[PDB]
Write a protein that binds this ligand. Structure first.
Ligand SMILES: CCCCC[C@H](O)/C=C\[C@H]1[C@H](O)CC(=O)[C@@H]1C/C=C\CCCC(=O)O
Length: 1195
């Protein structure tokens, strides 16, 4: 073994305690674990081996299906492969569950001793120790050995999953090209990423499909043997919870779908804000989106709030049920005339505790998980029944060939085809430009096949698609493509590709690994790599698809005019291209049009405590937690006092030699049931209300921060990084954290229930509990540091599996052309192994903790039992039965509590990642107390003085000392290097970061007012316009202040009305996604409407028309020039002609005012930088500009 596996040498005891799969924790306590540390798989779990195993039975099922003339069944195939193995775990399942029923009987007899307690005996005490001894062994079944068994069940699922991953990838490479049309990777990805992941989740439960009924029956048997048919009153309620719990499933599932539409609506809108934040902020449209997001959140939260409450009732059912079904039983047992006797009640109580899980939870889940599995199995079977490529398989000859792309109504892609080519030759193909006719190679490749026609091929085929592609590994590993590194040929061809000269620039060093998904290489350079493979593959047949002509350079001359044009003329090659300057040298050409071979011939034919403190206080007022803690505790007190009351009653019965006062004892007893269910539902609802209300707070406060956040904040943070929070980190605080949190609280008290009962009945048990405490803390400490890191290793190593699948499925035609079946299989098997090593650890490591934990839970029951016998002088008869009835329950819940502790402590990180945003830096307020007058912009005056600006605090200065006046009604253009010229001036004038120096507007110092007070009074048209998914009205006036005739006027100021007035909503036309239905220029026309409505006296225009239809551009100019003659207008130039009409130009190059003058005077100075920038025109058009400038000064 490359990585020796301790199961190979752990003794037969070792796997009971996981004693020896141990050193990995030694390492994990000191170090971050790493991908070599994880042990290799057991040899029998390897992806190839499980593949070959299961493929055999599936083939035999295909044989059965043919011979029996029926559909094959994949479930039958997997069964006959696994069943003779899988049965053995059944026997444990039987013996395990039988003991869960029998502990009650010996528990009875232990209690039975206390009913006939005599001090002057040792034999019954010895008899009791015997029962107490067997009660211990029963616990070691469930508490220790169970953790061996449960692992191997996990492995049957893990084994089954890996086999299916193998057979799937095998089937995919064999998949017909036609089926690929009927398929998409996303199906195979849903299949292999998720739908096959169902196969772990099934095997844990599969035996409950039958073990449940047996268990339930047996409980009814012992119950019939115990309390007679009075138990039928109780069991009926236990059954009713199965349909009822099923009922909740539909309702909350509905409400889940009821909410899904709004999280998308919020998150899709949220996406526009983070995408548009630059343009949003400059328009001062924060308020519009603020209203929307709030009200969608109000619409959304109302559903999730009601849903949580109709889930909160569900949790209290899992808490209080046992107190209901106990209550209806013994009430019946009294009224039908029995006394209550401690043994019989605590026997009955414990049996209900045992059956409850099997019927209330496990069997319900069991039928569910198989139901999800079986549908997945059917579609995988269907996928395994898709058609396959026919694996039947120096020169190529074709004659009379007439096949379609597919036998169909398509016009046949090839007709009249015959040709012959012999070693030493290049064929070519010519047809429509960029046309799919190169699919001819797929017929030569055998990817297509003759409907009728003769085809002959001998020797290997290289293929390159016009699509670039990369396998996994290094570029060299991609180039090697499973062939040996032939240094001499590698050097010769990498030189022939000129590729080493470029590889220093692309991989930055020869032996460098291709980054994720091929990220390192330019696609055009990656296009070279496929050809680099082909030339590296030294092939006998070269089938070349139409190359990326942008590569046409001396690199391509080395590739084409030497390597292809002379060397790879060895044996055969075919090059479909319109590179007729290379194909004029072609030996023969096949010419295709409308599917005809119209002619053929040679070319001459042509987490810290601060998290919890902030998270809870953001809920309801902090005093409410004190009231909440009374509900949490009071419920627990009602739950425990019920069974204590049930015990106390039996004791009073034992004094009787006459009746107990039924209607006092039973009256009170029923009181506690009413008490315990009521507080139970009361608790459950309250906790959700506090936390889901907390989600409401943290959302609003946090969302406020995004809008007040300065634009610099988005220049650092990637778009995804923020939107993920609104999508999924707040996602946790709605769907899942409150529920997971309540369950934890609901259990933690239950563990305190058992413990406090035990120590209150048997006071001296408090002593060993402290050792038990500190061990637990250290173990949780030692484990969780290790386990958290294993979780990361699993989460990482999974993604290559479908990533390899995805690129491989993209790579199909290449991979199959080279017949690289085993190399790709070896690779997919490899990843599945590395993932299997992580999944192997996750299973065993999670388990190790569980057994080294439930050992103490077993230690706990044992101390209660023997402690009870030790103290027998002191113990009251019923009170033994109480403490034992509780203790035997702990063997369940103790593991589940600590599972949830890690899950909440992990998920509480989503609270921290949201608090992070709630106090980011803010711009200066949107409004100041100092306020601009309504008449303010009526001067239209801009002052620049000493203006120094940086795109970030302390960053490079890109405005330097800039001091200038822009006067009323002036029209001035600004130009230079893009990063010196545009975003610098945009941001500083709009206070997107506070400029140094000073800017004044109409003798108002621009720092002195609120930012909406500023930004409302100016308009921007950016280079990239944006339209927001919503009405044309909202894209024009989200404040509804401008009437549709005004809006239509704008729509009639532009030409757009005659292109939108047809739309069904008119002004209320709900746009397509970002209005992609509208032309880019049309989006630009919309911004002008925003200006036309805004009517600002000051207008800043970015270089919008950099890529606009000239007549559309000149239309833009007309309305700009017309309507804003009185306005003061800044324009940034993509090209000088766009601004040559300006009264003046400011030249901002290197961040300095290189020029500020009349452009003609600038051109009158043959030394001016503007003249030099005009000299870059290289054309007499400078004169047309020159006159056009001069025309301004005619009068
Ligand atoms: C009252 C507390 C129980 C609430 C329901 C509980 O989650 C359901 C089943 C629990 C039960 O408490 C005993 C037990 O071990 C079950 C664990 C659940 C799944 C198996 C994996 C356990 C693992 O490896 O973590």
């Amino acid at each position: 073994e490359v990585k020796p596996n301790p199961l190979q040498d752990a003794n037969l005891c070792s796997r009971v305690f996981f004693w020896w799969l141990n050193p990995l924790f030694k390492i994990g306590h000191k170090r971050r674990l790493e991908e070599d540390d994880m042990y290799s798989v057991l040899p029998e779990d390897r992806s190839q081996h499980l593949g070959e195993e299961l493929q055999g039975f599936w083939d035999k099922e295909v044989l059965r299906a043919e011979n029996d003339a029926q559909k094959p069944s994949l479930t039958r195939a997997i069964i006959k492969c696994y069943w003779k193995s899988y049965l053995v775990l059944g026997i444990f399942t039987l013996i395990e569950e039988s003991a869960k029923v029998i502990q009650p009987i010996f528990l009875g007899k232990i209690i039975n001793y206390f009913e006939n307690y005599d001090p002057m005996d040792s034999v019954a005490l010895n008899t009791a120790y015997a029962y107490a001894t067997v009660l211990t062994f029963c616990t070691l079944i469930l508490a220790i050995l169970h953790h061996l068994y449960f692992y191997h069940v996990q492995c049957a699922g893990m084994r089954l999953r890996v086999a299916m991953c193998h057979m799937i990838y095998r089937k995919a490479l064999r998949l017909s090209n036609m089926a690929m049309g009927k398929t998409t990777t996303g199906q195979i990805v849903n299949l292999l990423s998720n739908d096959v992941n169902k196969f772990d989740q099934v095997t844990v439960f599969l035996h409950f499909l039958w073990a449940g009924p047996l268990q339930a029956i047996a409980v009814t048997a012992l119950l019939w043997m115990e309390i007679g048919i009075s138990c039928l009153a109780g069991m009926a309620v236990l059954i009713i919870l199965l349909p009822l719990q099923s009922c909740f499933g539909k309702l909350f599932s509905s409400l889940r779908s009821k909410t899904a539409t709004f999280t998308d609506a919020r998150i899709r809108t949220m996406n526009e804000v983070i995408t548009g934040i630059r343009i949003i902020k400059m328009y001062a449209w924060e308020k519009s989106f603020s209203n929307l997001i709030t009200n969608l959140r109000k619409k959304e939260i109302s559903k999730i709030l009601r849903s949580s409450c109709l889930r909160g009732m569900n949790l209290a059912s899992f808490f209080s049920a046992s107190k209901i079904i106990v209550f209806v039983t013994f009430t019946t047992y009294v009224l039908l005339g029995s006394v209550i006797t401690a043994s019989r009640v605590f026997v009955a109580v414990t049996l209900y505790g045992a059956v409850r899980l099997t019927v209330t939870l496990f069997f319900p889940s069991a039928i569910e998980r198989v139901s999800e599995a079986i549908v997945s199995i059917r579609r995988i079977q269907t996928f395994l029944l898709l058609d396959e490529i026919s694996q039947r398989n120096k020169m190529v000859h074709v004659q009379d060939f007439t096949a379609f792309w597919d036998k169909a109504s398509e016009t046949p892609t090839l007709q009249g085809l015959s040709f012959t080519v012999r070693p030493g030759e290049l064929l070519a193909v010519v047809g429509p430009v960029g046309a799919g006719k190169s699919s001819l190679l797929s017929a030569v490749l055998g990817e297509l096949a003759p409907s009728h026609g003769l085809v002959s091929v001998h020797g290997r085929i290289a293929y390159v698609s016009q699509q670039p592609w990369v396998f996994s590994g290094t570029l060299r590993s991609n180039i090697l493509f499973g062939k040996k590194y032939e240094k001499e040929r590698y050097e010769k061809v990498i030189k022939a590709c000129a590729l080493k000269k470029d590889l220093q620039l692309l991989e930055d060093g020869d032996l460098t690994v291709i980054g994720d998904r091929g990220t390192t290489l330019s696609g055009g350079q990656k296009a070279r790599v496929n050809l680099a493979r082909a030339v590296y593959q030294d092939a006998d047949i070269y089938l070349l698809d139409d190359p990326l002509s942008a590569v046409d350079a001396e690199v391509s001359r080395h590739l084409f005019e030497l390597c292809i044009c002379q060397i790879l003329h060895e044996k055969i090659t075919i090059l479909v291209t319109h590179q007729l300057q290379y194909l004029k040298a072609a030996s023969q050409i096949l010419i295709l049009k409308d599917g005809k071979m119209v002619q053929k011939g040679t070319y001459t034919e042509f987490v810290g405590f601060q998290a919890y403190k902030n998270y809870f206080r953001a809920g309801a007022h902090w005093i409410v937690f004190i009231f909440l803690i009374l509900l949490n505790t009071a419920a627990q007190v009602a739950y425990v006092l019920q069974d204590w009351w049930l015990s106390y009653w039996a004791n009073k019965q034992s004094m009787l030699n006459e009746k107990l006062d039924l209607n006092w004892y039973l009256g009170i007893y029923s009181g506690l049931t009413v008490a315990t269910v009521l507080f139970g539902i009361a608790r459950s609802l309250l906790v959700f209300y506090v936390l889901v209300n907390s989600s409401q707070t943290l959302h609003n406060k946090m969302f406020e921060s995004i809008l007040k956040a300065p634009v610099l904040f988005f220049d650092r943070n990637p778009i995804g990084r923020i939107l993920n929070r609104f999508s999924k980190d707040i996602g946790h605080l709605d769907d899942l954290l409150p529920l997971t949190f309540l369950d934890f609280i609901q259990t933690l008290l239950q563990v305190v229930g058992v413990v406090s009962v035990a120590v209150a009945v048997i006071p001296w048990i408090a002593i060993p509990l402290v050792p038990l405490g500190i061990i637990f803390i250290f173990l949780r400490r030692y484990f969780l540091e290790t386990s958290r890191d294993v979780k990361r290793l699993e989460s990482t190593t999974r993604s290559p599996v479908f990533s390899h699948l995805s690129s491989s499925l993209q790579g199909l035609w290449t991979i199959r052309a080279y017949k690289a079946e085993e190399r790709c299989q070896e690779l997919f098997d490899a990843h599945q192994d590395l993932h299997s090593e992580a999944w192997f650890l996750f299973l065993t490591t999670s388990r190790w903790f569980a057994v080294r934990l439930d050992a103490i839970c077993a230690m706990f029951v044992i101390i209660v039992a023997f402690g009870s016998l030790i103290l027998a002088k002191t113990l009251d008869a019923g009170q033994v039965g109480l403490a034992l009835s509780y203790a035997l329950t702990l063997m369940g819940m103790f593991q589940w509590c600590v599972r949830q502790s890690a899950e909440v402590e992990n998920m509480m990180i989503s609270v921290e990642r949201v608090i992070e945003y709630t106090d980011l830096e803010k711009e200066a307020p949107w409004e100041y107390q100092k306020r601009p007058p309504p008449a303010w912009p009526h001067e239209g005056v801009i002052i620049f003085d000493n203006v120094n600006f940086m795109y970030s605090p302390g960053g490079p200065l890109v405005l330097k000392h800039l001091t200038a006046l822009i006067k009323s009604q002036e029209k001035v253009g600004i130009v230079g290097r893009t990063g010196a010229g545009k975003s610098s001036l945009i941001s500083a004038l709009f206070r997107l970061s506070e400029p140094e120096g000073k800017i004044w507007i109409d003798k108002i110092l621009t720092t002195e007012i609120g930012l909406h007070d500023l930004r409302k009074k100016m308009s921007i048209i950016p280079q990239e316009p944006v339209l927001f998914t919503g009405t044309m009205r909202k894209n024009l006036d989200p404040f509804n202040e401008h009437t549709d005739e005004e809006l239509w006027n704008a729509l009639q100021e532009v030409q757009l009305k005659e292109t939108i007035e047809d739309l069904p909503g008119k002004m209320d036309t709900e746009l397509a996604e970002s209005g992609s239905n509208f032309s880019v220029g049309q989006r630009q026309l919309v911004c002008l409407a925003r200006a036309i409505l805004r009517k600002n006296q000051i207008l800043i225009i970015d270089e919008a028309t950099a890529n606009v239809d000239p007549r559309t551009d000149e239309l833009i100019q007309k309305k700009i020039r017309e309507k804003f003659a009185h306005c003061t207008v800044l324009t940034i130039a993509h090209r000088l002609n766009t601004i040559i009409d300006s009264d003046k130009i400011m030249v901002l190059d290197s961040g300095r005012l290189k020029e500020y003058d009349e452009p003609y005077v600038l051109l009158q100075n043959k030394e001016s930088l503007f003249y030099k920038m005009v000299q870059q025109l290289g054309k007499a058009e400078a004169a047309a500009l020159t006159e056009t400038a001069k025309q301004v000064y005619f009068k």
